[PDB]
Amino acid sequence: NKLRETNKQLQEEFGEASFLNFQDANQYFKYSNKQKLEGTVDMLNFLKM
Amino acid sequence: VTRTAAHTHIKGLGLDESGVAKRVEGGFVGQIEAREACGVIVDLIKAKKMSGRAILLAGGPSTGKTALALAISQELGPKVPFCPLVGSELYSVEVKKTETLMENFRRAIGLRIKETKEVYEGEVTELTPEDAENPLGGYGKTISHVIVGLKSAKGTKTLRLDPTIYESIQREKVSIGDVIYIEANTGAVKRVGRSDAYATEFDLETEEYVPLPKGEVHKKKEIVQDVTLHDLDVANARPQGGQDVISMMGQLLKPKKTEITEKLRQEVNKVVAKYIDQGVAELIPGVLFIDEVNMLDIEIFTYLNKALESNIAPVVVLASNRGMTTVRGTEDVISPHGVPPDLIDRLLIVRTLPYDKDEIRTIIERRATVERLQVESSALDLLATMGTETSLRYALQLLAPCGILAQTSNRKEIVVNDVNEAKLLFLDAKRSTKILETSANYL
Amino acid sequence: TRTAAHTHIKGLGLDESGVAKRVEGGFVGQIEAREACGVIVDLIKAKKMSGRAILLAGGPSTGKTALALAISQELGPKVPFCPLVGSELYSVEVKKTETLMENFRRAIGLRIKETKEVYEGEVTELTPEDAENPLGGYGKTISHVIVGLKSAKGTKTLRLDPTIYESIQREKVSIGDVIYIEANTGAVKRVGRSDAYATEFDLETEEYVPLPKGEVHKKKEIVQDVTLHDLDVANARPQGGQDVISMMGQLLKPKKTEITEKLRQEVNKVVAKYIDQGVAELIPGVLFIDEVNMLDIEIFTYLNKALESNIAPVVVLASNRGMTTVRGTEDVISPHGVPPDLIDRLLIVRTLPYDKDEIRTIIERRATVERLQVESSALDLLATMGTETSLRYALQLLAPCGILAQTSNRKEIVVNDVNEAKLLFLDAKRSTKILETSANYL
Amino acid sequence: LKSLSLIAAHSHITGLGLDENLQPRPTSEGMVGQLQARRAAGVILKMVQNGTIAGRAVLVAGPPSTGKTALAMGVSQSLGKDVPFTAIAGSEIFSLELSKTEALTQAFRKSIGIKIKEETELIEGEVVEIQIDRSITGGHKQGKLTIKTTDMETIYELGNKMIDGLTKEKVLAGDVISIDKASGKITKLGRSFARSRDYDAMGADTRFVQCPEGELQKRKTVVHTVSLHEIDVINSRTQGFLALFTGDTGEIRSEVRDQINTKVAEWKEEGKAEIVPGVLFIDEVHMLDIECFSFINRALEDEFAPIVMMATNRGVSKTRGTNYKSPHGLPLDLLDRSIIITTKSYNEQEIKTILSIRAQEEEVELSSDALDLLTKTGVETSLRYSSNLISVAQQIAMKRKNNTVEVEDVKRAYLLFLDSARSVKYVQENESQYIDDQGNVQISIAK
């Protein structure tokens, strides 16, 4: 619960371009959002495991 | 190349969607009643609601009881478990027959289990325990938990490893720079071998030099493997094995089979019910088939009288080929097919039928197609005739010698001369007893 | 407070070497039979004659097993009593001969009485008694060890030769802990710390024993009883914790083999060595074998061979048979199924059925044991039906009668209640009659 | 509900159909009729519940399919759980590895059960920190460890022997452990949830349970339902539980049985352990050996003799092990110390009610006239045959897909599957077709 708050905030903020390979290829801060989303999902499913 | 042993000509009952059996289908010619009853039994078993039912098949030999049993087994499919059994197989020497037949009863039904595990791979560089810089006053800092950075080319992580998984690592005697494979839950350790980097170090080495398998460090896989009930029964009653010395001794203790108590079975049943509530597993029914039942001991009949009463009893199909016969293990207990009436009260009787000349011709030509052997019309007529007057089995046995006599004559077809020569070189039971009647010394 | 058609027998119901009372110890009738039984019991108490056998014969419902339980009760728990049946002689694991031999050696029992003075209590003080060694030496020389011991309402200080230091090393006790000392053999034993020291540590695993009751020094008696069969097994079975034979006892199936005769003669020799010294004493037992008819001729021959032994105790046989074919040889028909060779070598007592007044007394005594009471009418009708049907059919109807009376909330039984009790359940004769009158295989 | 829901032979009967006054309703509880048999069975059940006397036997007499097994299992169900009920067969007792007398001994032992209670005093608490002066002073400096719970927390001194004890089962704090107050044995349960993120993958040892709630040390009594036979097994062998599961009892000698009985009596008089009345049931006892009969006669008089239930449909016939015959195929000695209950075949009303309740158990919807013709078959055939007929007719109907089972549906089901009478007629008229007993059978078809 404490993690998917940040996960959904990030998804609503930059979930349409950070997850996109093209936008994340050349963007100073959009890849930061992309990798933060990947990391929070990874901790989410690892905690579930 | 192609091997055939009196079977593989039948691909199940192959009945219509309405349940009506057509004249010729799947190695079956005619025999509408038995095939329809067998399809009804298939409808019984596929209902997945009822248990404890049973049926016996009756009739004279060579009528296809084995054929029908194999047909129902085939149409059920490999996924549906099946346990073949012979009457002579029940009589064992280690434990009384009741345990063996309960074992078969449990073996009948199966259960598929959903499971998920974790996959890890990479080469090894680190063999260090937890440093534990803080002594805390209780630790001379050291632990049997070797922290290894799992050096895969795509990822690396330092793991606090159990003493058992590190002991298995020591079993492989791993050094720096070699691919390893470990499990999150079980901790199973297997190495594909040393890396190809160290291949040039030694001009020769028994250890195989292998490349690093491609893939991420942490990988997750799921299995829905189907395991029958009695494999779990024996595993629970007796642990299967382990790499450790304690497990070696434990499996060295008692490897022979003995009885199975019901308490463990009921606990397993309850945990399986918990799983099906969770949806992890789903049960499937079972079928048990017994061969040549007339010889069974009266004690076996009495016990099977109550075996079907149990809620865990699956459908058991039965075959017998006797008339007014006394029950084995008895003296005056005589009944049809040599079975006490108390058993057959709950059973259903189905009877096979004989066949007409056209049926013998059809089965003979189907066999000839099965062994890809071509025959002439006159030889086909002779085979069908002599099968009608002697037996189907004798004709089936001498089918191959006819083709062999054709081949040694450089002929691809069986002629009248071929079957005549086969009859010259082979004799059936009738002329066997005719010859043995006029015997100097039991010729 | 439970019973099974028994426990109403109270011994034999005899008198001081006279004639038994007519109704004594839950007994009715068979005054001559139970007087002979008391004679047998006196013979057993004599503990002189060896390998004497006896058999009682009669019909069903004669109470032979009740009489056997009467011998068992009159013997007392001190005297061993080993019931046996001819069915268990047929053993899959080992031959019938060895099972018979082990049941034979189970009856006999050995008793040992042991004496030892005990010094016990809290160690108040420990000090050696230094002296001068006869040979000149610069080292110390202790001649005695003084220990201060404290028990309940008494304390004692005892001098000990300095050889007690080895024992105190084997014990590792210094102060504040209760110890165990014996007078002559010396040595030390540690039982636990004083109970008053528990408050010193909030958490500890050591249970602190209290101050021993009574004086520091005591002299108690040790009495132990063991059957010779148990001693045979102990001398035969291996024991260990680490040696290879120890877990060869494990990881396998421990089976009872035929004990070698040399072990039996050696244990008899050591029993003799401990009985002439007075430590041990031998009291013969008895083997009660009922339904001996079921035994085979081989068992009878081995009994004939073994009855002449000098460690052979009295053996009592029970059987309701008479002129019946012997098991093993169809042609040989002998009384009570036992071959006459044994019968000549044993004594025989005849048992007779019970009369109407005796059955009435049996019924009333069983009702009193059940703590359920029966009025005159039901008692009379139950006695009549028991006389006409059988003893056991009347005997076993008390529980259904009681529960049916309880259902109607009446404490006692009445005429229609017992009538219903007869109606629900049928005896052997009714069962046979309905068997022949039924054509439905019933 | 915990057992399998698969429909057994009698999945419609659950318990006993009697009332408080032991009066059976004509159709109740799932079993119909046998009013006298039901009342007698309830009498036996009430006496078992009483348990004040023992050493008695009871037998039921009736033809096959009359309800002997049905009544026995209904009595067992009405008995309920936690009361030891043992059901065995007269055939399985013939053990090639165990003596029949010894097997019967275990059969009697398993029927009776004992309840044993035990009280425990353990200290449960999550450890806060551990500080031992193992270097400044060394030699078990009697360090102090703090232990927390959700409601209270205290600091506990550690003695030299406690220092040695904590040297084993090493705990670095941040972990929930419990120590027995009496024996001082510490058990490491599992860490706190804060340790879940130390590493991604952990072995099977690390667990993260909640902090214990309440006071530090607590008192709790534990009651065990342990029958006599398993105690015999565990006392016979160093590890008797494996022999219990595998069944390798090894023919336990009777020498330890007296010792275990004395220990049971000691616990009873001390109040530590209490016994529970038990019921033993054997089906088709008509087949049995005379050694077993003699041993049963002997053991029925013992104090530890639970009620024994017999079922038999045999008439006056020969007993196995002897040449001569006897009533019920059973020796008169057993019939002497026994009570016999008579059961009869059901009438057409009882038969149709049984068919209706069995169809309801099978969840098979039927027609009125279909029920009438099924009852006609059941009265002409046996009762167990019409149940199978309607069972098969259910799948034939769902083949036809027209909801309820039809009249022609049952007719075709009967046509496809031979009855016992038709099977016997077919065998007799075609004895040449079948392999005769003598070993002669006609193989040729053409004449």
Ligand SMILES: Nc1ncnc2c1ncn2[C@@H]1O[C@H](COP(=O)(O)OP(=O)(O)O)[C@@H](O)[C@H]1O
């Ligand atoms: N109706 C049939 N259709 C086709 N093949 C049949 C038929 N009846 C018997 N067979 C043949 O009989 C063989 C098996 O005989 P089997 O059933 O073992 O004899 P029994 O009748 O003594 O059990 C099979 O190879 C099968 O080809």
Ligand SMILES: Nc1ncnc2c1ncn2[C@@H]1O[C@H](COP(=O)(O)OP(=O)(O)O)[C@@H](O)[C@H]1O
């Ligand atoms: N003197 C007696 N007084 C009262 N009851 C007796 C007496 N003798 C025997 N019994 C009864 O006989 C029963 C035991 O009979 P048992 O010896 O087993 O039969 P059998 O002698 O036919 O083998 C006991 O339950 C007891 O009630």
Ligand SMILES: Nc1ncnc2c1ncn2[C@@H]1O[C@H](COP(=O)(O)OP(=O)(O)O)[C@@H](O)[C@H]1O
């Ligand atoms: N009280 C009852 N109610 C309903 N069905 C019964 C009842 N008693 C017996 N049955 C029927 O009898 C059949 C089982 O007979 P069973 O009692 O096992 O024979 P036996 O008496 O030889 O043991 C079952 O199919 C069941 O439907």
Ligand SMILES: [Mg+2]
């Ligand atoms: Mg065949």
Ligand SMILES: [Mg+2]
């Ligand atoms: Mg007697």
Ligand SMILES: [Mg+2]
């Ligand atoms: Mg039955």
